[model samples]
Target: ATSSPSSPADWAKKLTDAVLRQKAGETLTAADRDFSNADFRNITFSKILPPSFMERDGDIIKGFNFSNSKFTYSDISHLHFDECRFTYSTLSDVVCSNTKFSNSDMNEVFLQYSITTQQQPSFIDTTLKNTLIRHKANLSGVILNEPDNSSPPSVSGGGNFIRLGDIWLQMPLLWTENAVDGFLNHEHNNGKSILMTIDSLPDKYSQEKVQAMEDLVKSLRGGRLTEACIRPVESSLVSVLAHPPYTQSALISEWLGPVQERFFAHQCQTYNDVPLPAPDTYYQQRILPVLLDSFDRNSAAMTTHSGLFNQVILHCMTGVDCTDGTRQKAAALYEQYLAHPAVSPHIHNGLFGNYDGSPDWTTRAADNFLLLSSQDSDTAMMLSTDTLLTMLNPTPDTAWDNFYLLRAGENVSTAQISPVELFRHDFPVFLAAFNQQATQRRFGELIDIILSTEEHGELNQQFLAATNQKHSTVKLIDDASVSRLATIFDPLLPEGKLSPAHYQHILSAYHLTDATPQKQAETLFCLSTAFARYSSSAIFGTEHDSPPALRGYAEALMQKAWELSPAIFPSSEQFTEWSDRFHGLHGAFTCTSVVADSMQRHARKYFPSVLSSILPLAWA
Candidate 1:
C-alpha cells in the first residue's frame, strides 16, 4: 500500500514509521511522495517502490533507490546505509548533506549536478558513470574507483570546469572548514557524516591542521624577494615606466635609487659606478670560480645544484653584469655558449637577453639613502619617487632614443625631400624609426606611434597643404592637430608599419572635416577593430604580438575615444558592449601596460642615461 502525507517532513515521518513497523522481509511502497527537505535519519528499508522519486514541487526527480524504496532530495544526514544496492539511479541536483555510504555497492549510478556541502564527508569508492561535479568538493581520504570519462559534463561559463578526479587536488582545506561550520551551526541540521564523527577527533588533530595552514603562510612570506616577488614587482614597474613623463632617464634614476639601495642593504652588497669587468678576465677568472663556489655552497647546504652553478657561470661569461661593456660581452658570450653543450641551453633561453650593462652611480647612491632611511614617511616617499623614476627611465637605450626622437624633426633638413614625400614617407618614417629605436633601447612601449598636433600641423600646413580646409589623403595628416594635441595629454599610440586594414580604418576614422562625436566614435571603433584583427593574424611573430594585448590596446583606445565624447557615444553603453564583446579586454591591456613599464624600470637599473631624453615636456 502507498502512504502519503501533507508536507515532505510529514511524509518522511510517515515513511519512517512504516519502515519501523514492517518486518525485515516485508516490502513497502511510497510512490509519488514529495520528500523535499524531509529528514530521513536512521531509516532502514528492506524493499521500497518508485525507484525514481521527486522532491516537493521539484521538476526533476532526485534519484535514490533502495531495493523497493527511494529517497529524493530528502535530508539523509548522519545516515548509514548497509548492504544497500543503489543501481541505475540518478542523483543529479541532490544535496548529500553530511551523508555517509559505507560498504555500499553503487553500479552505473548517475551523479550529475550533485552538490555536497563542505560539512558533508562522502566516501566515493563505488563505480560511477555520467556524473558531473559542479564545483570543488572535499574528498580528503576518499579513494575513488575507476570513473568513466563520460561522468563529467562541460560547464557553460569558464568559471570552474574541474572533474571529480581532478577536484580532489584543487579542493582547499579552508573551504572544507567553511562547509563544516555551515552544517554544525544550523539548528535544523540532522546529524550526519563528519559532523557526528567530529566529536571523535582528538584535539591534537585540529591543532595540527591549524598549525599546517600557519606554516604554509609563513613559508610563502619568507621567500618574498625571490623570482616570485620580483616577477610581480617587475610587472608593476614596467607598466608605470613605459609611458611618457615617466619614461625619462633622470626620473628613472630618481625612482630606482632607493629600491636598489634598500635591496642591496638588506639582501646583498651594493655596487656603485663599478667599471665593466673585462670579457677575457670575466670568462677565465669569474665564471668558473663563481660556478665552483655556488656548487660547493649548494652541496654543503644539501640541495641539488645542477643548473644553479651553470647559471652563474653563464651570467658572468655573457656579460650579464651591470656595467658598460654588457652588450658586447653578452653578444660574444651568447655566440660562445651556443657552441658549448654544457651552457648552450642557458644562452638559447635568452638568459643574457638584458645585458646592456650601464651602471647608475646616482641611483646607486640614492638607493643607499633609501636603505639608510628608517622613518616610515621617509621610506614611503623614497619608494614613491623610486617608482616614478623607474617608470621615466627604464634603460640607457630607451632614454637616449627618446631624447633623440624628441629632437629628430626639430631642426632637420626638410629641403632634401619632396613636400608630399615628407608627410607620406620622410616624417612617418622618422616617427616609425624613432619608435622602433626606442623599443630596442628601452625594451618597453610596445605601441610606438606618438605624433604631436603642433608637429603634425606644421608638417600638414607647410608640407601637405596651404590651408586648414585642404585635407591630405593620409588619414592622420588631416587629423594631425587632434592627434598631436591628444598626445600632449594622453598616452601616445606606438608608431610601426601599419597593416592595410589598420591604415584603412585610421583613414575612415580621422579623414573628416568635422570632428563630430559620431565620427570620433566610428574612428575609435574602427581603430579597435583593426587592432583586434591585426593581433589575431599571424603576420607578426607569435612571441611578440599576443591577441590578448592587442585586444587590450583596442579597448583602451575605444574607452579614451568615448571619454573624449560621452554625449554622442555614451560611456555606459560603450563599456557594456566592450565588456560583452571583448570579455575583459581592458584588464589584459592594463596587464600589458604594467609589464612594459616594469621591463623599462629594470632596464634603467643598468642604463640610466638612455631613458633620460624621453621625459615628457613638463619633466624635460
Candidate 2:
C-alpha cells in the first residue's frame, strides 16, 4: 500500500495540489501506481520524484509524475521546479510553455516529439544521459545548463541546434567551388591513392610533404587557378617543408630538380605551343642507354641538372608540329610528372608568387614589362576600402587607427573638405551602403558620444585633449574599453534595440577622471532609461523599419551586449521581467518584444546549466 495515495486519480490530484502549494519543505510519495495522462498545469514541483520508479508503466505510472502527459497546444506557463528528478520518463508531445527547471536530474528521459512554443524550458545542472529528443526541438533562445558532461548530446535526426555565431562562419564555405570545398572534396575523393603513395615514400621523408602534394593535386585539378586561391595552398606546403621530419638538403635538392624540370617543360609546351621528340625516342636515345652504361654517373648528373634545360629544349621544338605518337608520349610524360613526389610542391609553392605582389606569370617577359609597370589599381582600391571599413567598424573603441586618420585627412585635403564636413557628408552615405549590422549599432554609439559631449562638456573637452596625442591617450581609456562600453550600453537600450545600446557603449568607452562605482552604475542606469524612453518615441521608428540589414545589425549588437553584461536592465532580475516592461511601453518597437522574448527564453534554459556545471562539487 502506498503511504500517500492508492488510486491513480487521487494521486494525480494530490500531486497537482502539492505543486500549487509551493511547499519547498514537503515530500510526497506515490511509490507505486499508474498515473498516466495526468495534468499538472501551472504547478511548481518542489519535491523529488520517486527514486528508481518509472513514470510510465506500459500506459500506467506508479509515481507522482507529469511524465507521459499530453499537453497539446495548452498553456502551462510559469511552471517552476527545483532539485527534481525526471529520470526514465516520456515527455512526448508535451508543450513546456514558459517552464523553468533548475538543478534537476533529467537522465534517460525520452523527450522525442516534445514541442516547445515561445517559452524555452530551462535545464540547470541537468543530467541528460541517453536522452532522445526527436523532431525539430527549437533550441533557439533555449538555455541548456551544464550537463553532467560538457560533451555534446548525441543527435541523430536532421534538425540540430546551431549556435548563432557558427552560422556566420559557415557562409563562405557554403558556395560550391570555394576553397574549403576544393580542398576537402579533393581529399575525400582521392585521399586513398594519395595516402598509399605517401606511405611508400622513405621514412626519412616527412609525411607533411606528401600531404602537401596531395593538397596541391586537389587545387590544380580544374586547371583554372587564381593567385588568391593558390596562395593558401602554397603557404601550407611551405610551412610543412619548413618544419622538422623532412629537412635534409639532399632530399630537398633531389625533390626540387624533377618538379622544376617537369613544370617548366609543360609550361613551354602549353604556352608556346611547343612540340617535342616522342618519349620513346628521347628515352631510347638519351635516358635508357645512359642509365644502363653508367647509372652512378647519370644519377649525380640528374641531381645538378637545371630544369631550364628542359624549358629551352621544349621552346626550340615549337617550330614543328609533332605526330600523334609524339603527342601521346608528351601526355604520358605529363601524367608521370603528376605522380612524382618532387613535382607538385615545387610548382605549387616555389614559383607561384612573383617577385612583386602581382600574380600574372607572363609579367616577367620584357614584352609584357610595360603592362606590369603600372600600379595594380584594383588591388590598391580593395585595400583602401578594407582599411576604411575596418576603421569604421573597429572592435569597440580602444583607439582609432593613426593610418586611417591620415588617410581620412588625405581624402579631406584632396576633396577640400573639413573633418566635420567629411563626418557630416560621408558618414551618412557610408551608413546607407553599409550592410553590416554593426554599422547600425555604431551609429547609435556616435549619437551617444555626441550626447555625452553635450552633457559633460568639461569632461568631454578633457577627454578630447587627452586623446589629441596618441602618447597621452593611454591615460584616458583602460584596456577593457570594449567591456566598459557593454556595461554602460547594455542597461540603457530598450530590451531588444541594439542601436541605443551601441550609443551608451561609446560613452563608457571614453577615458575619464576617477568616478565612483555607484556613479558609474547610476550613469549606466540613466542611459538605459533614456534609451528606453527615446526608443518608445516615433522618431527612431521613422528612421528605420524592419530592414533585414538593420535587423541583423541590431541582433549582433544585442548579442555582443548580452555577452558583456548578462544581467537584466536596472536590476539582476531574470531577463523576462525586463522584456515584459519593454513590451508594455506604448509606441515601442514590436521587434524588441520578439527579440527580447527569444533572448529571455534562451537565457532561462541555458544560463543555469552552464553555471551549475562549472560550480565546485562542494557548492553543488
Candidate 3:
C-alpha cells in the first residue's frame, strides 16, 4: 500500500487500490487526506460496508469523494467531506461529528442520524431521492429533484409547505432589541469608546454635535446605550447591532434634538439648509406625497438628489427607531432601496402619480399599486403610517394616489384607510389587473390592495364559508389583531402565540430556529403557484421530474394544493413539473430533521417533499 499518491492519475490509482483492497470486514482508514479532484467511480469496496465495521478507524477525511457510494455504521468523526457528492448513496447509523460537507449534493441518498448529535451540521444544493433524513438540523444549489421516502419525516405547519418561521434567521440582517421601560439600550458593555463618543459630546448640543450624536445612535440605540444594571442581557432587553447608521439617528433625536422631522417631509432636502415645513395645507398635499416611496413621479427628483434622499429617509427612520429593531430596520431598508433607485425604481413609484397621459410610464400603475407589502410588521405599519401622515397633514395636489383620491374625496381630516376607505368602488381598473395584467410587481400590489379592501373581508368570508362547505376545519386567526405589531418582543411569551417581536427575535438567534427561513420562503413560492391564475404547466411538463422516492412528497403537497386552493395549482402533474426543481433545497428541504427539532426542541414540523429524490432543496 502506498502511503502517498503522486499525481492526479497516480492518486486515483492508489486511492482506488486502497479502497478495493479492503476485505469483507477489514476497515478502510484514511484521514487528513487530500482528494485534489480525483475520480474513483469505477471500483471500491463493491457496495456499502457493514455498520460498526469501521469502529472509528479512519483519520479525519479532510477531503474525499464518496459519490454513488454508501457508508454504514461507521464512526467518521472530524471528517471534512466538503464538496463531496452523495448521489444514490446511503449513510445508515453513521457517527460523523463536527464534519464538513459544505456544497455537497446529497441526491438519491438515505441518512439516519442520532437526533441528539451535533455532528453533521451545515451545507447546500441540489437533488434528493428516496433520501430520508431522520434528524433535525439545518442546510444549498443545483437543478432540484423529487423525493422518494415511502415514509416522510414528521411535518407540522400551516400550509402544506414546510414552515419557514422567521425569515430573518437565514438572512444577513439580525434583529436588535430595545429596553422595556420606555428606554433604549440598557444591557450593553462592548464599547467604552462608543460611550466616550457619547459622553465627550458638547453638553449644550449644537446642530452639528446633535447630528454627530445621531450618527452614532443607530448602532447603539434602544437601550443598547442604556446601563447594564437596569436590565440584564439575559433578561432579554438588548438590541443587536453589527454596524450601521439609522438607530443612531433615532437615539440622537431624543438626547440631542429633532433634526429630521422637516427632512422626512422633504421641505428641507439637506441637513445644511434646514428648510422647515410651513405646517400649512400645502405641506401635506405637495411635499408629503413626495416623501413616500409610493410616489408615482419621482424618477427625476430621485435622480437629481439621490444621495440626499437616502440620508433623509435613513435619518428619519433611525430617529423613529429608539424603541426596537423592526422600526429601526425599516429605516435601514429605506436606505438600501434608495441605494439602487435605478434597480428598484418601481419600489417607491406607484403611490406618487395620477397616471395622467402626461406621464408615459410604460408599465407603471398610477393608482392600484400602493406600497404596503413590506415583509415585516414594523415596516408594513410604517408604510400605512406614512400614508396616514400625508392624509392627516395636508396637500395642495388634489389628485392623490388612487386609494386616497377615492377614499374620502380630498378631505384631509376625514380621509382614512378604515373599512370605509373601501377599494372596490374606486378601482374598476383592478378587475383588468386580476384578469390579465398579473406581472410580479402588479400581482404583488394587487394582492396588497385586495387584502386591505373589502375584498379582504370577502376572502375571509370565503375562507369561513369554505371551511363549513369543505369541512377542512381550517382555523383563521384575527388578521387585524395580527397586523397590529407590538414594538418589543418578550422572548418569554408563551409558545405558539404569534409575536412579531418573537418572529423578529427568531432571526437574530442565528443558531436557534435557524432552519425556519428556508421553509417560509418556500411557502411564499408555492403559495404563489396556488394564487396564480396562470401557469405554463403545473404538472407532467416532462416524463418524470420525480424520482421513485419523491413521487409521494411532491404529489402530496400538490394534492394539498388541489384540495385547499385550486386557484394556485393546476394538477398533481403540474406540481411534478416543479417536483425536480427543489432537489435537496429544503432547510437543508431549503434542510434537516432527526431530533431537538432543527435544534430548540425545534424541527417546527414542516414539509412539501415530492419526497423521500434523494431529498431536500425547496426553493426552485
Candidate 4:
C-alpha cells in the first residue's frame, strides 16, 4: 500500500484518482471514501472532478461521509444523498436538488438557486447551522434539525436560531396556520425574526403555483398578524398581474391585486387597529416597485386591453408619487411606453393614449420631446393632455360627441375646406370600402366595446353648435331609424306584435345587434335622460298617480314583455342577455325601464289615452 503523500498535489491526485471511478447508480461503501474535515481546510484544486457534479441528469445517486471535503466553487446535484456526513465543511457555491441527509453534522451548510420538493425534501435529526435556501428552492417539507425540544423546532433550549430568511427557505414544513401562529407567538429577538422572514420573501413569480393557504401565508407574519387577526397575501403573481383578462395593462392599485380580501380582513381586525397611514407609501414600498418591474418585463410583448387598463392604474399610482425614486422611474417609463413600438396600437387607435381627441374618454399622450418632466408635472401634463384631446381636438372620429367641430361652417365657409369636407369626400369611398357582406362581421369585431361607456346627457342638443354657430343639415338623430325603433322604445307595441325586421333596423342603427346584444339592452335604456326635462310628462303625466287607462297599458306591456317569446320581440332576449351588465341603482331592474317622462315623449304634444306614474319607470 502506498503511504500518504507529503505534497499537496500528490494528496489531491490520490483523492481525484479514487473519485474518478465513481458513477451514478453505483453504491460506495465506507472504504471507498476519503479523509474527514481535518487538514483539507481552505483549498480545492478541481483539475479532476465529477461531470455529474456540474451537469445533473435525472439519475438516482448514493453518497458517503466525505465530511471534511472542501468543495469551493464546486456544486453537486440530484444525488439521493444517503447517510452522508457533510458536517461543518467548506461547501461554497454549492448547488443541490433532491439531495438528502441524516444524523449528519451539516450545521453551517447552505445552498442556492436550487430546487427542493413537495415530497419531504430535507431530513433532520442532524445539524443545520447558519443555512440559507433559495434559487427557487421548494422547501415544502424541509424541516430544521432536532431541537433541544424537537425537530423543525431545531432551536435548542437557550441555543441559537437560524436567520429568519434562511429558516423559511428550508422550513421544517410548509407553513400551516398552526406553524405560522406558533412562529408568530414564539419569542425570538422580539418578533424581528418573523419580520425578517416576511421581508425576505422574493416576488412570487415562479410560473408554478404553490399550495392554497400555504403560499398565501408565506410572508404574512408579524405581531400585527398574530393570534386575533390573521390575514394572508394573494397566492401568485399571475393572480396579481392579470385577472378578468384585460388587466395586464390595467394600472390598478397594488392592493387590488396581491393583498386582496383576507389581508384586509386581518388588517382591519388586528393589532392593526390603526388604518395604514399614507397608503401610497405602503404601496410604493411593498408592491409598486416590483409591480412596475414586472410590467416593464412583460409589457415588451404588447399593451392589450388589460395592459391599457394597467397603464391607467400604473400612472395613477406613479402620478401620486411625484417626488420619489419611484416617481422618477415612472417618469422614465412613461416616455418609453409612450414611444414603445408594441404600444403604438394603444397610443394611436386603442383605448387610452393618442386616441383621437374627443369625448372625456378618448384623447389619451407624451410630447415636447421632453423626457425629463418632474413626476407631478408629468402626471398633470399627461392627464391634462388626454382630457384636452378628448374635449378640444378639431378632427375627431365619426359619431363622436365633438364631431360638430367640422360640420361645414356657414353657407360661404364651405370654401375653407373643413374636416367635414374630407369626411364628405371620403364618405362614398369609405362606404364602398366596407363590403356589406363582410362589413358587419368585420366591424362586428368592435362589438359593443367602442360605445360601452358612452355618456353625454344633451347628446344631440349641442349638435348644431359649430365654430360658425349657424344652422346646418347635419342629422345627429337618424329620424328614419326612430320610426322603426318606436315600437320597441314606445310603450306597448300595441299587443306586442313586432317583427324581426323592426328589431334589425333599430338595433343595427343604434349599433345594438347580435354581436352586441348586451348594448341593445343598454340602448333600450336610452329611455333617455334627455326625455326627462319636460316635467310631469309621463305615460301617466296627466295624473300624479298612474291613470287607470295608463296602468292598463303598462300592465299589458309588462305582461307582453314576459309572455312574448324571443321570436316576436327580440327585445325580450335583451333582459336575459344584459341582466348582469348594468350597475348602480338601475342595475337591479331590467336594463330598460320606460320612465314617466319617456311615456310623455312617446305621447308628446299631449295624449291622455296612453299616459301616469309610469314616470318613475320611464325617467330612469
Candidate 5:
C-alpha cells in the first residue's frame, strides 16, 4: 500500500485508486478512505461509485467525505453527491456543467468564480458559508451564513445567476472577509445580493425600504474630492432625515432643498474652476423636462421617490466619480444604516452591534460621533445643530467627553471636548477634530488665540503673527478689517487651506470683486499667513513638518502677495526671504535676481527717466 501522497497529483491518484478498490467490492480501511485535501478535478463520482448506485434515478451515495478538498481550475459535469460532507473545501474558478448535492454539509466552504451550465446543479438542504455560482444554480434549499456565523453573507461580483425552483435569477459574485476581494468592498455590485434579499420581503413596503436602503448603499459607494465632501450629509440622512411615512409636497420640497444646496449651489465643482451650470436654468432645461417626461402625473409619493433617486444618481455620476476604498466604507456604513432605528425600526444587533442599549448621554454621544466619523467626511452639512443634537441622542445636558474611543482603533492625538462652533455649522471641522486628533489641538489653539484677543478691546495682530514667527501684515489693514478678516478666515482653519472656489466664494460674499489693491493684498497676506500657520501646526509643532500640499499652498500665497504688493516688505532682505521661501534656495542665482532684471527691462521700456531715478532702489 502507498503511504499518504505528498503532492496534489499523487493525492488525486490515491483517491482514484481507493475509489476503484471500493468499486471492486473491497472493504476499504478507514486510513485508505481518508482522502481529505485531495485534488478532485479529473474524476466523476458516478463513474467510481458502486454499480448498484447507478441502477436507479433516485440512487444516492452516502457517507462520502471530501473534507477540506479542492475542486478548482477545471470543468465538472454530471456529478452527484447525497448525504456528503465537503467541510472547509474550495470550489474556485471551476465550471460545473451539471452537479447535484442533497442533504450535504458544506460548512465553511468557499465557492468563488465557478459557474453551473445547461442542467443546473441542485443543492437541496445544503448548508453554505461562501458560494459563488457564476451561472444559474438551484439555491432553494441552501442555507448560507456569514463567515463568523453572524448573518447572511453579502453577495458580490459582476453577473452570477441563480435558479430557485422554477425561477431564474441573476446574482452577483460572492466574497468573504478572508479573501482579497472583501464582502465590504463594493468594487463589484455588492448591492445585487442585497437587491435579491429585498425582493424576498413579504411586503412590498418593506421591499421598497430595503430597495431604497440598497440604492443608498450604491449611491454612497465612491468619489472625487468635492463629491466626497458632500457625502457626510447624504449619509447622515439615514439617521436624521425623516423616514417613509411622508407627505408628498413636504418630502419633495425637503429633498429639493438639499439637492439645490448640495449639488447646484455647492461650492464644490466637478472639475477645478468649472462651476455647475446655473441652477434654475439647468433644472428647467434638463432636469425638469426629464422627470416630466418619465414620470409625469405619477403619484406625488412615487415622484418624490424618483426625485430622491434622481438626486443621488446625479450626485454619484456627475459629482462623485467612482470607488477607491469607499466601496468598503460604504458597505460597512450600509450595515449600520440597516441597524438605525429610523431606517429599520427594529434596531437589531448587526456586524457593529445593536444600538438599543440604554446608555448614558456621554455614551450615546460617543457612539453617535463614531457613527458620524465612520461615513468618512469632514462635516454633516445637511444636518443642523438641532438635528445633530437629536442624532447624538444625548440625555439631559451631558457633554461628550474629551476622549473618544474611535472605532477604527487607537488614535495618536488627544481628543478635546467638542467646541460650540462645530455644533453650529462647522461640523466638518468637528469631524476632522474627532477623527484626526491633530486638527483638534491645532484648531483649539487658534480659536483660543483669536477669541481671547477679541475679548479684549482690540485684536493683537503682532502677538498672533509671533505664534507663527512671521511678520505681521495685519498692520497694513485697519483694526476692524483685521478683526473681520479673523472672523472670516479662522473658521476655515480645521480644514487647513482654502480652495480656489472657496476663495472666490468669499470674494463674492464680501463684495471684494473690485476691491482696492490694499484690500486684496491684505486678504492675500492673511491667507498666506494662515496657510503657513495651519500647515505647520495641524500635524506638528517642531519635530516633523507640514504636509506637502499645505506647504505648497503657503508658498503660492506668499508668491501672490509679493506680486500684488512687493512694497509690503520694508526691506529687500524680507522680499528675498519671501521669494526664497516660495521658490527653493538652490545653487546659482536666486530666481528673484532674474525677476529683478526683467522688471528693470520693463520699467526701462516704459519710463527710462523714472527707472533711472529708482535704479539704486531697484538694485538694492
Candidate 6:
C-alpha cells in the first residue's frame, strides 16, 4: 500500500501516475482521492476518477466529493458525475466540454477567468446554492441547468434552488395567484425568493434557454424581480453575448470582460431606454471592439445582415458620444455596411458619399444621416458636412465586388444577376450563409432595437414597412419564426385592441398573425398608456367627465401588461405616472379610494343590468 504524498509536487506526480494506471486497467485507492484545496491545473481527466465508496461505471463518477478543490486551466471532458458534491470548489479557467453534473450540490463554487469554445458544462437537476460565476465564459457552449420534469410541481417548497448570475431561482413549481402575489408582496415564507412558474419558463433547455426554476431569491446587486422579469434581465446579462457580432472574433473575450462587470454594476432596467446614455458602455465595451477586430482581420471578406445589424445596434446604443471619437468609428462602420454589394434598393445610389461643395441637398442629407445614426438629434455635430452626407448617401458604383448570384427554388450557384435575383439573394443568401443557431441568436436583439425607446415616428414605420416588403417571401421555420422578420411594424395593423370587434378586425387583417412576445407586450402596454391618456383628458374637462369606470379599464390593461412582462413599465416612475393618471385628481395615489368605492356601488345600484359600462359586450 502506498502512503499519502507529503508535498504538492509529489502529489501531482502521484496523481498523474494514478491516472496512467487507471487508463491501463487498474483501480485507484482512497489515498489517490484524499487531496483538498489542491491545484490540479492543466490536468486531463479523460475518464472520471471515482471515489472509494462508488464503483466506477465506465466514464461516470457518482456520489463523489470534490470539496474545496481547484481545477484552474484544466481539461475535464466527456465525463459524467451523479449526486456529486463540489462545495467551496474552484473551476477557474477550465474546459468541461461534454461534461455533466446530475443531481449534485455546488454550494459556494466559483467559476472565473475562462474562455471556452464548444465546452458546455451542464448541471441537470442540481442544486446550485450560493454559487459565484464571473469573468469565465463559454463561446458557443453555455452552461445549461436542466430541471427534472418527471412529475408536475406542487405549490410551496419541495424543489431545489439554483443561482443564475446572482439570483437563486427555484426549479419546477406550479404558480397560482397565492404564490405569485406572495413573492410580489414579499409575503412568501421562503427567504428572499422570486417566483418562477413552469409556464413562464421553457420546458427544455436550448442555447437560448438555460434552465427553469422553483423558488427564486433576490440578488445582492439588484432589486427583487418577479418571474416575468427574469428572462429579459438574464438574456441581456448572459445569453445575448453567446452569439453574433459579440462572438464573430476572439476579441469578444477581451471586450466582454469589462462589459460583464458593467452589467453587474447597473440593473437590467437601465438598458430599456430608447437610446442609452452618452458613451454607452455596450458600444464602448462590446460592439465597437468586435467590429474593429473583424475589419482589421477580414477586410476583404464579404459582409452580411449580421454585420449590418451590428451597425443598427450601435445606433440604438448611441447617445451623444460623438465628441469622443466614437461617432467617427460609427460613421466609418455604417459606410462599410452600405458598401456591401447585396444591400437592397438603389434609393441613395449616385447621390451619397460624393456630394460636392453644394450645401443644399448634401446638408439636408447630412442632417438626416446624423439623426438616423444617433450622431445628433439634428444637424452635423461631428463629421464634415460632405463626409456626413457622403456616409449617409452611398453611390451604386462603390458596391463591393464580393457577392454570389442564385436563382429561385434551387440551391445551385449562378453568375447571372438581375434586380429580382439580388432582392431575393439579399435575405435568403445571408439566411443560408449562417446556421440555425446564428440566425435565431439575433432575433430578440432585432426586436429590442425595433421597439427601442426613441420615437422615429413615420421614418421608422416606413423603414419597417420597406424591410417587410423586401423579405415578404421569407418562409417561416416554426411558430417562433414570426420574430425573425420585422412584421410587428405592419403599419396597417393596430395595437392594444381590447374589444372583440377590435381584435377580430386585426385577425381579419392578419395583424397579429405573426408577432413576438415583446411585440405582444408592447401592444398591451401601449394601449394601457392610451387609456391613461384618455382618462387624463377627461379629468381637465377637455372632452367629458371621466368616471371611475374609465380608471378601472386602465387598471385592467396595466395589470395584463404586468402579467406579460414585469419590466413593461421600465421604471417605477412610469408605474407611478400610470397609477396617478388613472386615479384622477380627487383620488390621488390610492388604488381603492372611498370616492371610487362609492362610484362602484352607485354604478351597481343604477346600472346593474347594463354590462356595457364595465365590460365590452363582445368580451361579455
Query: Which pairs of residues collide in candidate 5?
Result: 156-173, 157-173, 160-171, 378-428, 379-428
For model 5, the stretches where C-alpha displacement exceeds 4 angstroms are 1-33, 41-61, 115-120, 130-137, 144-620
Compose the digit string of candidate 6's lDDT tens values, residues 242-345: 33433443444444444443432232223321112223444454334344444434444213223233333244234333234444554555456445543222
Give the alpha carbon lDDT tens digit for every residue of 259-281 in model 4.
Answer: 44343233223311111212243
- Give the Cα-based TM-score of candidate 1 against the true structure: 0.22
How much lDDT does candidate 6 score? 0.39
Number of clashes recorded per candidate: 43, 14, 96, 35, 5, 10
Report the lDDT of model 6 for residue 258.
49
The local lDDT score (0 to 100) that residue 34 gets in candidate 1 is 25
Report the lDDT tens digits of candidate 1 across residue range 477-532.
12443344344323333442233354334434334335665555454543444344
Report, for every candidate in turn, its global Cα lDDT versus the true structure. 0.33, 0.33, 0.32, 0.33, 0.40, 0.39
What digit string (tens of lDDT, one per residue) describes model 5 on residues 241-359? 22332112343334534433453323222211221222232233333222322222232312123223222222222222323332233223334443443333222222112345321
Better of 5 and 6 by lDDT: 5
Output the lDDT of residue 410, model 1.
28
Looking at model 6, report the run of 10 residues with the lowest lDDT sum: 371-380
Q: Give the per-residue lDDT of model 3 (tens digit) for 1-620.
A: 33343443454456544444443334655442334333332222212323332334442222345555535554444444444567656565555554445556665465554433444443333333445543222331122233233443333321111111100001102123322221222223221122222222233333333343343344334334333332333111112221123235556435322222322323323321221222233222222322443222243443334333333333333232222443344344444443442423343333433333122222223321222211211111112333323322223231234233312112123244432223232322222222221122222333343244353564434322331121223222234322321111112223413234533432232222455444433333343332211111121111222121222222233333344344433345544544434233442221111110111111122233311111111111
* Candidate structures ordered by TM-score, highest first: 5, 4, 6, 2, 1, 3
Backbone clash pairs in model 5 (N, Cα, C under 3 Å; residues 3+ apart or in different chains), count:
5
Candidates in order: C-alpha RMSD to true structure: 23.1, 24.2, 25.4, 27.2, 26.1, 23.9
> Which scores higher on lDDT, 2 or 5?
5
TM-score of each: 0.22, 0.25, 0.20, 0.26, 0.27, 0.26
Model 4 residue runs over 4 Å out of place are 1-12, 24-27, 38-46, 50-52, 58-61, 68-83, 92-105, 108-141, 146-162, 165-620
Best by lDDT: 5
lDDT of 2 by residue, 134-171 (tens): 32222222223222433334444322232111110011
Q: Locate the minimum summed-lDDT window of 10 residues in model 4.
A: 371-380
